[PDB]
Write a structure and sequence with these properties.
The complex is a heterodimer of chains A (69) and B (288).
Chain A: E1 10-11, E2 24-29, E3 39-43, E4 48-51, H1 58-68
Antiparallel strand pairs in A: 2-3, 3-4
Chain B: E1 6-7, H1 9-44, H2 50-66, H3 69-76, H4 84-113, H5 121-137, H6 140-143, E2 146-149, E3 152-155, H7 163-195, H8 204-235, H9 243-260, H10 263-272, H11 278-286
Antiparallel strand pairs in B: 2-3
Helix pairs in contact in B: 1-2, 1-3, 1-9, 1-10, 2-4, 2-5, 2-10, 4-5, 4-7, 7-8, 8-9, 8-10
Classes of the chains: A alpha+beta (69), B mainly alpha (288).
The structure holds a molecule of 3 linked components (NAG-NAG-NAG).
Subcellular location (chain A): Secreted
Region (Chemokine and involved in interaction with ITGAV:ITGB3 and ITGA4:ITGB1) (chain A): 1-69
Glycosylation sites (chain A): 9
Chain lengths: 69, 288
């Protein structure tokens, strides 16, 4: 669609690679309006980071996060 | 590391009220004015010339365009599920059709004045059909990629090549701005250059009308496309972008895009509402 109508607020340039699995406090799924598959990670430092969804370690991080809180 | 996400939430939250308001305005004056065009023509004077055909078609394109806006405002709130494909389709088709018929006005009057080529209502309807079809084929790359996912209108970029948004921006820039503006400017320049030296006593008003057309077109479409250009420059990696720059560019895009939508509200006052035919007197004068 056009620009006036957009529910995408997150754009990722790069991805975080591997660590760690304990620093995370919450995670958010990227908006559909973005059209780009990405995961948002909020750590204990209240810092946000981009992470590629199709990663072996990501699927293992979301596990601990979803199970814990 | 540095994969820190560039958040855009505040920009959207701030742009939402303005966009909603402007959409409301455009729907108001647009629907009113253009339906008024159609009514005025259809009853006060059944199509007497090709100009009337093109005017009705222009008002129809504008109506179709503005009637999509309430749906978009309903979209902006609560992010109801209505097909994205069809709405985007009507959006871009109506837009491109509006631009096309705007060009066709200048063309028709150009061939009418200088080269003295005259088209009956029949041919005008034919060409109108042509323009609508051409408007649909040129809108295809703008809505055929749009789909509904998670109750949101999205363009799956990962499934498309990186060249696509650039090509789309370029096609929009030259197709919606460059080639209509160039044509209407050339045509109205020739027409004005002929009428200024014409025998008609009050040639002036004709020129003023045409000038007004061009000027308005510019002051409503140029900001948007000029933003599109630097956006393309960002996508083309010709310039460097920071998070703040991407934000500012986003805001600019949204706002100016909303600005460009009022042009269809100005269209009734530019051709149909303008008044008596000072051009018809010149028309009778040139037939000698
Ligand atoms: C990017 O924009 C978002 C627009 O709202 C910001 O807020 C997020 O809004 C989501 C609405 O779609 C919330 O969704 C929640 O999803 C859970 C599923 O896990 C549902 O149960 C909840 O009902 C639903 N809540 C609401 C109110 O719809 C997100 O929770 C919410 N996320 C956050 C972090 O507030 C995003 O915040 C914004 N991005 C950033 C980085 O701020």
């Amino acid at each position: 669609q056009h620009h006036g109508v957009t529910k995408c607020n997150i754009t990722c340039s790069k991805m975080t690679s591997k660590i760690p699995v304990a620093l995370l406090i919450h995670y958010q799924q990227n908006q559909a309006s973005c059209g780009k598959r990405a995961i948002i990670l909020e750590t204990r430092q209240h810092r946000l980071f981009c992470a590629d969804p199709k990663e072996q370690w990501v699927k293992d991080a979301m596990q601990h996060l979803d199970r814990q809180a | 590391e540095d994969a820190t996400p560039c958040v855009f939430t505040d920009v959207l939250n701030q742009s939402k009220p303005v966009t909603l308001f402007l959409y409301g305005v455009v729907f108001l004056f647009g629907s009113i004015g253009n339906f008024l065009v159609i009514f005025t023509i259809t009853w006060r004077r059944r199509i007497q010339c090709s100009g009337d055909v093109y005017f009705i078609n222009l008002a129809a394109a504008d109506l179709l365009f503005v009637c999509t806006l309430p749906l978009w405002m309903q979209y902006l709130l609560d992010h109801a599920s209505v097909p994205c494909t069809l709405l985007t389709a009507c959006f871009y088709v109506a837009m491109f059709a509006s631009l096309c018929f705007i060009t066709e006005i200048a063309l028709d009057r150009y061939y009418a004045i200088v080269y003295m080529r005259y088209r009956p209502v029949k041919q005008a309807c034919l060409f109108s059909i042509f323009w609508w079809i051409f408007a649909v084929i040129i809108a295809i790359p703008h809505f055929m990629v749009v789909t509904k996912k998670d109750n949101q209108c999205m363009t799956d970029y990962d499934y498309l090549e990186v060249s696509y948004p650039i090509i789309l921006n370029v096609e929009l820039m030259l197709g919606a701005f460059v080639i209509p503006l160039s044509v209407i400017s050339y045509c109205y320049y020739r027409i004005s250059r002929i009428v200024a030296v014409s025998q008609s006593r009050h040639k002036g008003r004709i020129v003023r009308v045409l000038i007004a057309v061009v000027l308005v077109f510019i002051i409503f479409w140029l900001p948007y496309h000029l933003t599109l250009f630097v956006d393309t420059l960002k996508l083309l990696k010709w310039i460097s972008s920071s998070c703040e720059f991407e934000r500012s560019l986003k805001r600019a895009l949204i706002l100016t895009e909303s600005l460009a939508f009022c042009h269809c509200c100005l269209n009734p006052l530019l051709y149909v509402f303008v008044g008596t035919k000072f051009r018809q007197e010149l028309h009778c004068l040139l037939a000698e």
